[PDB]
RNA sequence: GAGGUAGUAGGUUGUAUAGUA
RNA sequence: CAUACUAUACAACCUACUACCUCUCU
């Protein structure tokens, strides 16, 4: 089995001598497959000849021997809107009170109201009064809230208390208008 | 392009005007100013290099630092002028007087310094290029120069006062004294402003759109905008006074003007952009107080956005914009809704206004159903650098390039740009332009208005209240704002800006008044086309009135259709140089309208037009004359269009045709097979046997020639492959030989050699000095012998092959010879009788008594063949005798262990008892079965030997007994053939195959020598058939230097325009009344928007009834007839040239010589060895191949066809000559020529295997067994007929050609043989022999002089075909000397050539060859755009010749390499050495750009930057911005080779001798290493992993990017002008980085 | 001598990609 | 574009040589 059919045919024919005749007769030397064709003989005086085709000459000899063997077998506006809802989820009654009531009145103390709103929406405020003086000779302060992103509002007045109250009123109307939708 | 001709680009227009007179070029860009300054420096240097004159460039940014300026590099890199710029504190070292420097760059104070020293004489200077003089300080420095050198200097002696002042409209200061400022400017520096630039030449020669100023309304300020302004004014004063205790004002200020001029919703949409930018910028704040400031700003923008959104989205987009926006955007939308291709170029002032306009236009386009055709894209300005934060730079780069791509072709109409859209960027032709902001100056007015060139065009400026503060102060919120929160001056600015527009129109009227060339109004053209359209046209096909027609309009539109369609590059705009001029005749004004054509065109004379009353009538009739002369000289076809690339028709009768055989015509007209001329198609050709070997068998009585096959060992086989250690057997000493008996004489043939088991043996054929008369019994004796030798001894007889003793094909006899004992060789008759005595004899199985009879003989088995009779009975294997062994016995030791002694072995295996025990033994080796001894067995064809056997196996096979083969001499039969004769017999078939091949090559040589007198016909022996054997940072500075002349320029044309020096109001008021009453100001409440005899009499009032006669119109020949009669009547027409002197003078006033030719008269022709080599395909696996002869033959083919296409067609340009060469060189043509002249059947195309691919002599194949799928009867029918008696008596099972008589051969291989035979004839019998071979094949490439045959011509002067029915030969002559293109349309064209060729003697010394006809040199240098060349043609069609000359020179030199390159190492040593980059590098290195004449800006800049980067490299060979190559300079390198070829009586030796000194050291440098090319290396070292992508378009519009993708190693990108240079540089950077 | 490997070296043809003019 | 000269990678086939295996020969 490990012997090739060429050598199988040679072994089978070796029982009476004989030198086989192998002749490549017909190649189709075509454009991409060179196909070879041999022809196997059996003596020139008395009595066998088969043909064999293949792609390679070793396979042509093998097929000829086989034939002879068988023949033999944008998103920042979305951030703005998300800021609007994360200020909206603080649903206390102070926001509705600031919306319904006209806020011309400045008699309220704004610092406790902004503290209530900051604790309502889990925020905290920080006052920074600038020690340096303006050209108008009045105090100025800025208030910071831990928002998304963090925000700073403004206030100024002849006293530091006036500046703080102005910034606080700014925060009050601020939270009023971003509780208006 | 219609009625105005086509304008030159403004640089050479300013060059021509400043050539004409003194000129203040009011040009902004310093690069174009430097190009213009360079060009007039070299032109008035050419005028100045006559008696010795100097031209200066007194300058102000020169003489403090020691570095050369930009003009120094510009002028000493790109000219031959030795500039001597004054370094700071010149000491003028030694004797260095200023005469011997052409350009003499200075400082104004330095110029007076040598003016008072009397060194630089003001008479002797030819040009004074005073630099930028539109400023006060430079004027005050220049005042001592011209206050003190105007009075002593007459204007005759005063030179040209070219002065490169700034752009006039943004120059100095104010508006009232503007005209007086320019007036004092020209009166001081003695000049005239001649400002003809892109600011001007869009107004002049291009369309002028009807511009409209529209007032919208002032913004009546509503409650939303009141509340928003209250909030922003509340925080503005707060931001104004910020502090820090241990930027945002600009973004809180500029938001308010959006509210002031565009409205509240736009304020929201701009505050969103500002909010995103502020949240981008506020995170990186390192300061606590600034962090609070930016948080204040961001949250204020938040509350404004949410307030506006809650305003117009809870209480409520066309109506939304209508109610909550400014009237300015309503006017914008009205303007856009009036329109329904549109290309809109809206501008802005600030980069945020563009984006809120982007949101507005997108929202209206996606909401309003009317304006669905609005594709919006936007851009900002550029500020930052790639050095800092490259992420933002690359993101902006990729965004802006995509935006400009979308706007570029047809997709995006509205492009709401900013100030980067004025200079630089090239954009499509605009239809409607809406300048949103009022223009800052006239610059932004017409670098936005003066770009719209389509003319249904409107330039609309929306205007409003000006930029003024609407702020109220530091107040807090108001009561009305609290109520809104809880519950929910046109005339002044318009008058001042209409005054501003009147000032711009005064500016543009001033600019037009300073133009040299005046323009008629459009009412003149309307009058002309209304009145005078009754002149007869030109109809060259006048019988049918539907075709050819040149009227008044088509004529002026049909010279801009001819000059554009011409050979030109991107550095060349082609145009006709029109000139009007005036005269008065019979009391009327007439205008002669002279034209000129591009020097690219072969209409090389002016068409001097005929007068007309107006100027546009003169223009239209001069274009009539141009079209008429164009078609009469032949450039036009019957449709009056230029001929075009394909449409050229050959005139010589041998050419055109190109009709193949019908077998090839059917495939080339059907297009369904593999294409002919290619290797894809296959054809089977019959193996043509020799003439001398067909029908040649000797008969009883005919004395036949005898030809011994004389063999001789030359190289014995070295013992390293002698694995058996056998004896060396030289066939020279062998007693028995072989011979050929034939009846047709074999010619002299080349002694080849075969490689057999004894080494190399040379094979010859030698005659018998006595002829042999052969009887009738000996005929059947030789007939027995041939059957024995080629059927039994060597066994080559196939089943489909039989011995035919009366045959036609392969019909030669073979005889066994023998050396005579007394000396000499003869035929072995006793041996043939002995051979005939025993035929195909069965070897005799002898009994025991015969072996017992006689003992061993040590003389029988010397030179014996020892086949054994006990095995292989019917046909035994034949063993040689190698050694006789007395040291072995039949009773001696066995090799193996399985058997005892040799005698014992022979009884146990078969049964042959050996009756002699004292006998010696025989060591044998097998006979040959691979009969092909053509190739060397142990060596390659490069020469380096293959490995031989190891010493272990060789010593084992020479010593050990388990190897080898051993036979007893009493049990074997000696064959009648001795072993020496068996070796000659087994080497016979290669001798006969090679002798048939050499005879086929001799047959081809005989055929051509019979036809065209090319070689001898019959006969010295041929030569033998032999087989053959940091700085890179210093880089950036130079590049930065180039960008320096752009860089400051941008800033210099953005902000300053400063420094004024020291009737108008009435015109301003008139223009104000015109702009207010003429509808050009739209107010703020309306919407936007004759008898033929008398006509001929007024048409030419300078008799008319006779010329008119009875017909309707007038003929043009009649018109020039009346003008010629008026010339003969009235003396002269002395002329006033209304606004050229630019061109003038025509309308004015033995080491391997490459061309070695042997004497073709009396020549033997080429040797059949090298014709065999040229006929040997590469599939032959032989020691000879055509493939090194094909690549020299192909290059000679291309060279010779290029030369003949140049000589015959002296008027056609290269664009169709390349088409003719591609017709006459293509492998279809060479294949059809080869098939016509019998070349498919003369080639070898297979490895010669004699058991499969050979007819032995006197054997015959019936040629029918292959198509089929006793022997005496088979004989008698196979001479009669095949098919009728044949019928009477791993795919494609119909299998093609039988292998013995045919060989499958592709078409392109026949083309390869065509080229190979051209090369073979070239190498042997010269270039003329190659040319006559191509004429023999069918490509006729030489002239014909048909002369009468001179009475048996005898000498047969070669290339002269056989006479036809009359005694007339057709002798081919040498190539003709062509026409030198010194076109004598000028009366002194030789002196004009000497004047325009000034100072090229440095170039001649840089090349060596002194030209004898220098017009070729000028034709080689001259670009297609060097318009003052009224002497020759351009350089394209001569580069066409020079490229082919250089390709042949390179491939013939590199073929002559002793290294013996492959076809691939001949291509790759050429295609890496004739390349545009390396051509440009030797051009720059050897001083070619220093003598290249052109008048193109972009080519000058490209040439400058490339010479800079080359001079920093010592002339050696983000984004990957590399320097572009001057393709023009590589083409100059080709074209100078062409001009040296043509000027030298057409010899390649002088071209090679000149080009060796440049190219040949560099040639050895390539010839050692392996150069390749950057794209080729990057796809070679990365054989599959590189993948190049589709193009992307940059923002600039003249740059492409590439993006190499080297897979899993790095993605790299580079930029360049076109795809080729950009792809080369991107792959080059990939190569440079992946090392 | 025949067959199976393995390597080196020569090619030829097809496919894909690409150079140079 | 087109048209000559072709390169690399991969695939198939043929050919020369070298070393070892199985059979045969010896
Ligand atoms: O069987 C081959 C080999 O044994 C024999 N041979 C013997 C001696 C020598 O020096 N060389 C040699 O090749 O020849 C037989 C066939 O080989 P070729 O077909 O001729 O290569
Ligand atoms: Mg052999
Ligand atoms: Mg090839
Ligand atoms: Mg060719
Ligand atoms: Mg070829
Ligand atoms: Mg062998
Ligand atoms: Mg190889
Ligand atoms: Mg080219
Ligand atoms: Mg190739």
Structural commentary:
- The complex is a heterodimer of chains A (181) and B (1635).
- Chain A has six helices and seven strands.
- Chain A has helices spanning 5-13, 57-72, 75-88, 93-100, 110-120, 160-177; strands at residues 21-24, 28-29, 34-41, 49-54, 125-130, 139-145, 151-157.
- In chain A, helix 1 (5-13) crosses helix 2 and helix 5 (110-120) packs across helix 6 (160-177).
- The two termini of chain B are 53 Å apart.
- Chain B has a domain at 12-213: P-loop containing nucleotide triphosphate hydrolases (Rossmann fold, 3-Layer(aba) Sandwich).
- In chain B, a hairpin with a 2-residue loop joins strand 8 (579-585) and strand 9 (588-594).
- Chain B is 40% helix and 8% strand.
- Chain B is α+β, with helices and mostly antiparallel strands and 1635 residues long.
- The radius of gyration of chain B is 47 Å and the shape is elongated.
- The longest helix of chain B has 31 residues, at 1307-1337.
- Chains A and B meet through strand 1, strand 2, strand 3, strand 4 and helix 3 of A and helix 9, helix 10 and helix 16 of B.
- Chain B binds a RNA duplex (21 and 26 nucleotides) through strand 21, helix 35, helix 36, helix 45 and helix 46.
- Chain A: Residues 74-181 are annotated as: Necessary for interaction with Dcr-1.
- Chain A: Keywords: Cytoplasm, Repeat, RNA-binding, RNA-mediated gene silencing.
- Chain A: It is found in: Cytoplasm; Cytoplasm, Cytosol.
- Chain A: Homodimer.
- Give the structural class of chain B: alpha+beta
Shape of chain B: elongated
Please report which band the strand proportion of chain A falls in: under 5%, 5-15%, 15-25%, 25-35%, 35-45% or over 45%: 15-25%
CATH fold label of the domain at 12-213 in chain B? Rossmann fold
List cofactors, ions and other ligands: uridine-5'-monophosphate, magnesium ion
Number of strands of chain B: 31
Beta-strand portion of chain B reads 5-15%
Query: What separation lies between the terminal Cα atoms of chain B?
Result: 53 Å
Class based on secondary structure composition and strand pairing of chain A: alpha+beta
What is the helix fraction of residues of chain A, given as a range? 40-55%
State the end-to-end distance of chain A.
92 Å
Radius of gyration of chain A: 52 Å
Cofactor (chain B): Mg(2+); Mn(2+)
Region (Necessary for processing certain pre-miRNas, such as pre-let 7 and pre-bantam) (chain B): 1-772
Subcellular location (chain B): Cytoplasm; Cytoplasm, Cytosol
Pfam families (chain B): Dicer_dimer (PF03368), Dicer_dsRBD (PF20932), Dicer_PBD (PF20930), Dicer_platform (PF20931), Helicase_C (PF00271), PAZ (PF02170), Ribonuclease_3 (PF00636)
């Amino acid at each position: 089995a490990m012997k090739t059919p060429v050598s199988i045919l040679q072994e089978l024919l070796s029982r009476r001598g004989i030198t086989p005749g192998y002749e490549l007769v017909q190649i189709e030397g075509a454009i991409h497959e060179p196909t070879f064709r041999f022809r196997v003989s059996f003596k020139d005086k008395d009595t066998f000849t088969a043909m064999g085709a293949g792609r390679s000459k070793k396979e042509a000899k093998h097929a000829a021997a086989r034939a002879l063997i068988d023949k033999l077998i944008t998103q920042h506006s979305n951030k703005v809107s998300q800021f609007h809802k994360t200020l909206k989820n603080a649903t206390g009654k102070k926001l509705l009170k600031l919306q319904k009531t006209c806020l011309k009145n400045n008699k309220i103390d704004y610092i406790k109201l902004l503290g209530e709103i900051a604790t309502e929406n889990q925020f905290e405020v920080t006052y920074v009064d600038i020690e340096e003086k303006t050209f108008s000779g009045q105090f100025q302060c800025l208030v910071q809230l831990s928002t998304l992103p963090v925000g700073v509002c403004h206030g100024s007045g002849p006293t530091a208390a006036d500046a703080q109250r102005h910034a606080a009123q700014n925060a009050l109307e601020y939270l009023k208008i971003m509780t208006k939708k | 392009h219609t009625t105005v001709f086509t304008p030159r680009d403004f640089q050479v227009e300013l060059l021509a005007t400043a050539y004409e007179r003194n000129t203040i070029i009011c040009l902004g860009h310093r690069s174009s100013k430097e190009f213009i300054a360079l060009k007039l420096l070299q032109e008035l240097s050419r005028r100045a290099r006559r008696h010795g004159r100097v031209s200066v460039y007194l300058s102000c940014e020169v003489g403090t630092s020691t570095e050369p300026c930009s003009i120094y590099t510009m002028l000493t890199h790109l000219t031959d002028l030795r500039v001597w710029q004054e370094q700071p504190d010149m000491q003028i070292p030694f004797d260095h007087c200023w005469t011997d420097y052409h350009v003499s760059i200075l400082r104004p104070e330095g110029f007076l310094y040598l003016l008072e020293t009397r060194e630089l004489l003001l008479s002797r200077v030819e040009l004074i290029v005073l630099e930028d003089c539109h400023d006060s300080a430079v004027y005050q420095r220049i005042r001592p120069l011209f206050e003190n050198h105007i009075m002593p200097a007459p204007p005759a002696d005063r030179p040209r006062i070219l002065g490169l002042a700034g752009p006039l409209h943004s120059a100095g200061c104010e508006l009232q004294q503007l005209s007086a400022m320019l007036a004092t400017l020209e009166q001081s520096v003695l000049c005239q402003i001649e400002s003809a630039s892109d600011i001007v030449t869009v107004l002049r020669y291009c369309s002028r759109p009807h511009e409209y100023i529209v007032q919208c309304a002032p913004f009546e300020m509503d409650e939303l905008s009141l509340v928003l302004a209250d909030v922003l004014n509340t925080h503005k004063s707060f931001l104004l006074d910020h502090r820090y205790d241990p930027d945002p004002l600009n973004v809180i200020n500029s938001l308010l003007v959006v509210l002031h001029e565009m409205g509240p919703w736009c304020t929201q949409r701009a505050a969103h952009h500002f909010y995103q930018c502020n949240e981008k910028l506020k995170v990186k704040t390192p300061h606590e107080r600034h962090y609070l400031l930016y948080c204040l700003v961001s949250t204020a923008l938040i509350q404004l956005y949410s307030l506006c959104e809650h305003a117009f989205h809870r209480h409520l987009s066309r109506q939304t914009i209508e109610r909550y926006s400014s009237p300015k955007v309503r006017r914008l939308l009205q303007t856009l809704r009036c329109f329904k291709t549109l290309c809109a170029l809206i501008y802005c002032n600030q980069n945020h206004t563009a984006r809120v306009l982007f949101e507005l236009l997108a929202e209206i386009s996606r909401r309003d159903p009317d304006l669905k055709f609005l594709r919006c894209q936007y851009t900002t300005d550029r500020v930052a650098d790639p050095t800092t934060e490259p992420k933002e730079a690359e993101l902006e780069h990729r965004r802006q390039e995509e935006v400009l791509k979308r706007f570029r072709m047809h997709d995006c109409n509205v492009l709401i740009g900013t100030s980067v859209l004025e200079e630089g960027i090239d954009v499509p032709k605009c239809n409607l332009v809406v300048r949103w902001d009022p223009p800052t100056t006239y610059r932004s007015y017409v670098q936005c208005k003066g770009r719209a060139r389509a003319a249904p065009a409107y330039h609309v400026i929306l205007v409003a209240p000006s930029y003024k503060s609407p702020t109220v102060g530091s107040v807090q919120l108001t009561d009305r704002s609290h109520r809104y929160i809880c519950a929910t001056s046109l005339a002044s600015t318009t008058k001042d800006l209409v005054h501003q527009m009147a000032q711009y129109r005064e500016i543009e009227q001033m600019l037009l008044s300073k133009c040299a060339n005046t323009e008629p109004p459009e009412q003149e053209q309307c009058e002309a086309e209304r009145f005078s359209a009754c002149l007869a046209a030109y109809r060259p096909k006048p019988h049918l009135l539907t075709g050819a027609s040149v009227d008044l309009g088509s004529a002026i539109a049909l010279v801009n259709k001819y000059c554009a369609r011409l050979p030109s590059d991107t550095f060349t705009k082609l145009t006709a140089l029109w000139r009007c001029t005036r005269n008065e005749r019979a009391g009327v004004t007439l205008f002669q309208y002279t034209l000129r054509l591009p020097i690219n065109s072969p209409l090389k004379h002016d068409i001097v037009g005929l007068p007309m009353p107006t100027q546009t009538l003169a223009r239209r009739l001069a274009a009539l004359q141009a079209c008429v002369e164009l078609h009469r000289i032949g450039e036009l076809d019957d449709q009056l269009q230029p001929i075009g690339k394909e449409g050229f028709r050959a005139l010589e009768p041998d050419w055109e045709c190109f009709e193949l055989e019908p077998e090839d015509e059917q495939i080339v007209q059907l297009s369904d097979e593999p294409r002919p001329g290619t290797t894809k198609r296959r054809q089977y050709y019959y193996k043509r046997i020799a003439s001398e070997f067909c029908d040649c068998r000797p008969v009883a009585g005919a004395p036949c020639y005898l030809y011994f096959i004389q063999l001789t060992l030359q190289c014995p086989i070295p013992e390293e492959q002698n694995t058996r250690g056998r004896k060396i057997y030289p066939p020279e000493d062998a007693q028995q030989g072989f011979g050929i008996l034939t009846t047709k004489r074999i010619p002299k043939l080349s002694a080849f050699s075969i490689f057999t088991r004894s080494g190399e043996v040379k094979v010859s054929l030698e005659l018998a000095k006595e002829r042999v008369i052969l009887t009738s019994e000996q005929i059947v004796c030789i007939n027995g012998f041939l059957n024995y030798t080629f059927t039994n001894v060597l066994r080559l007889q196939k089943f489909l092959m039989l011995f035919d003793p009366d045959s036609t094909e392969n019909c030669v006899f073979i005889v066994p010879t023998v050396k005579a004992p007394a000396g000499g060789k003869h035929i072995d008759w006793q041996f043939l009788e002995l051979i005939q005595a025993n035929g195909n004899t069965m070897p005799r199985a002898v009994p025991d008594e015969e072996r017992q009879a006689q003992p061993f003989d040590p003389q029988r088995f010397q030179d014996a063949v020892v086949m054994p009779w006990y095995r292989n009975q019917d046909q035994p294997q034949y063993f040689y005798v190698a050694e006789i062994c007395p040291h072995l016995s039949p009773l001696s030791c066995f090799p193996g262990d399985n058997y005892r002694t040799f005698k014992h072995y022979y009884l146990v295996k078969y049964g042959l008892t050996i009756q002699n025990t004292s006998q010696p033994l025989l060591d044998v080796d097998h006979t040959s079965a691979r009969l092909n001894f053509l190739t060397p067995r142990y060596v390659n064809r490069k020469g380096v030997a293959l490995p031989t056997s190891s010493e272990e196996t060789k010593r084992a096979k020479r010593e050990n007994l388990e190897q080898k083969q051993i036979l007893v001499p009493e049990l074997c039969t000696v064959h009648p053939f001795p072993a020496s004769l068996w070796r000659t017999a087994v080497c016979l078939p290669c001798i006969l195959y090679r002798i048939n091949g050499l005879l086929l090559a001799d047959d081809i040589r005989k055929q051509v020598s019979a036809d065209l007198g090319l070689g001898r016909q019959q006969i010295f022996e041929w030569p033998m058939l032999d087989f053959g054997w940091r700085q890179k940072q210093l880089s950036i500075i130079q590049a930065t230097n180039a960008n320096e002349r752009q860089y400051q320029q941008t800033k210099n044309l953005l902000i300053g325009f400063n420094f004024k020096h020291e009737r108008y109001e009435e015109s301003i008021a008139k223009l104000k009344t015109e702009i207010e009453s003429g509808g050009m100001l739209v107010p703020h409440d309306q919407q936007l928007v004759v008898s033929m005899m008398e006509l001929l009499k007024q048409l030419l009032p300078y008799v008319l009834a006779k010329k008119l006669g009875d017909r309707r119109e007038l003929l043009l020949s009649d018109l020039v007839e009346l003008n010629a009669d008026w010339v003969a009547r009235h003396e002269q027409e002395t002329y006033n040239v209304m606004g050229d002197s630019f061109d003038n003078y025509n309308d004015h006033h033995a080491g391997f010589s490459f061309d070695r030719q042997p004497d073709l008269v009396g020549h033997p022709g080429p040797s059949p060895s090298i014709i065999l080599q040229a006929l040997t395909m590469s599939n032959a696996n032989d020691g000879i191949n055509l493939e090194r002869l094909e690549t020299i033959g192909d290059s000679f083919l291309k060279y010779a066809i290029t030369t003949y296409l140049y000589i015959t067609y002296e008027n056609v340009h290269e664009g169709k000559l390349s088409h003719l060469r591609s017709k006459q060189v293509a492998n279809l043509n060479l294949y059809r020529l080869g098939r016509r002249k019998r070349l498919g059947e003369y080639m070898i195309a297979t490895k010669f295997e004699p058991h499969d691919n050979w007819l032995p002599p006197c054997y015959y194949v019936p040629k029918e067994l292959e198509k089929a799928l006793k022997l005496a009867d088979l004989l008698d029918i196979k001479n009669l007929s095949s098919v009728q008696i044949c019928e009477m008596v791993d795919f494609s099972c119909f299998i093609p050609y039988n292998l013995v008589s045919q060989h499958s051969i592709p078409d392109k291989s026949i083309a390869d043989c065509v080229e190979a035979l051209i090369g073979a004839y070239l190498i042997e019998c010269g270039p003329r022999g190659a040319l006559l071979f191509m004429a023999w094949l069918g490509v006729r490439v030489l002239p014909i002089t048909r002369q009468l045959d001179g009475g048996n011509q005898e000498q047969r002067i070669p290339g002269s075909t056989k006479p036809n029915a009359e005694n007339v030969v057709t002798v081919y002559g040498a190539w003709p000397t062509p026409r030198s293109p010194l076109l004598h349309f000028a009366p002194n064209a030789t002196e004009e050539l000497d004047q325009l060729l000034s100072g090229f003697e440095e170039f001649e010394e840089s090349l060596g060859y002194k030209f004898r006809d220098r017009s070729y040199l000028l034709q080689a240098m001259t670009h297609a755009s060097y318009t003052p060349n009224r002497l020759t043609d351009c350089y394209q069609r001569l580069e066409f010749l020079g490229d082919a000359v250089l390709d042949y020179l390179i491939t013939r030199h590199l073929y002559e390499d002793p290294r013996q390159h492959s076809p691939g190492a001949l291509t790759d040593l050429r295609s890496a050495l004739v390349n545009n980059t390396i051509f440009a590098s030797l051009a720059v290195r050897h001083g070619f750009h220093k003598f290249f004449r052109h008048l193109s800006p972009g080519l000058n800049d490209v040439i400058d930057r490339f010479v800079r980067i080359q001079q920093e490299n010592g002339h050696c060979i983000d984004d990957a911005e590399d320097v572009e190559v001057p393709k023009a300079l590589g083409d100059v390198f080709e074209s100078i080779a062409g001009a040296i070829f043509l000027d030298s009586n057409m010899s390649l030796d002088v071209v090679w001798h000149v080009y060796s000194n440049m190219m040949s050291p560099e040639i050895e440098q390539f010839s050692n290493s392996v150069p390749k090319s950057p794209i080729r290396e990057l796809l070679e070292l990365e054989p599959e992993t590189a993948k190049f992508g589709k193009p992307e378009k940059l923002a600039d519009g003249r740059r492409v990017r590439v993006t190499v993708d080297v897979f899993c190693k790095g993605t790299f990108r580079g930029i360049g002008r076109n795809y080729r240079i950009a792809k080369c540089t991107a792959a080059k950077c990939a190569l440079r980085q992946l090392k």
